[PDB]
Amino acid sequence: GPQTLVNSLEFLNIQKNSTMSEIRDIEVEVENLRQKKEKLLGKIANIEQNQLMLEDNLKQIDDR
Amino acid sequence: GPQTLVNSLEFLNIQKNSTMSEIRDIEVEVENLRQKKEKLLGKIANIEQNQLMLEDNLKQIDD
């Protein structure tokens, strides 16, 4: 009967909630990767800023 | 002195490049997860295209 099609709906619907939840898992990985990247850019920032407190000293001594 | 300073800048720079490398690595990983999410969002649509039809079919039946 037509209960078969209603059955297929609620199945598709189940599959959809499942697909959604996998999408949400993905959004989490992405966010957590996005932060790791931000930390890493902090490192660079500091490296560069440390480097320039050196390049300072070098070209100050480069005429002593 | 200038050697110490040159040795130091260079070392830091090794670190920099090697850090910019993990950054390129994350960026690839993130690209992949985006393409994965794009496909999954496609599939959400396929699911609903299908459901709509089944639902209309069930209405047609009501007549």
From Swiss-Prot, chain B:
State where the protein is found.
Mitochondrion outer membrane
Signal peptide bounds = none
Q: What does this protein do?
A: Involved in mitochondrial fission. Has a partially redundant function to CAF4 in acting as an adapter protein, binding to FIS1 on the mitochondrial outer membrane and recruiting the dynamin-like GTPase DNM1 to form mitochondrial fission complexes. Formation of these complexes is required to promote constriction and fission of the mitochondrial compartment at a late step in mitochondrial division.
Q: How does it assemble?
A: Interacts with CAF4, DNM1 and FIS1, components of the mitochondrial fission machinery. Interacts via its N-terminal, coiled-coil extension (NTE) with FIS1, and via its WD repeats with DNM1.
Additional facts recorded? Present with 3730 molecules/cell in log phase SD medium.
UniProt family annotation:
Belongs to the WD repeat MDV1/CAF4 family.
Name by which UniProt lists this protein = Mitochondrial division protein 1
Look up and give the organism this protein is from.
Saccharomyces cerevisiae (strain ATCC 204508 / S288c) (Baker's yeast)
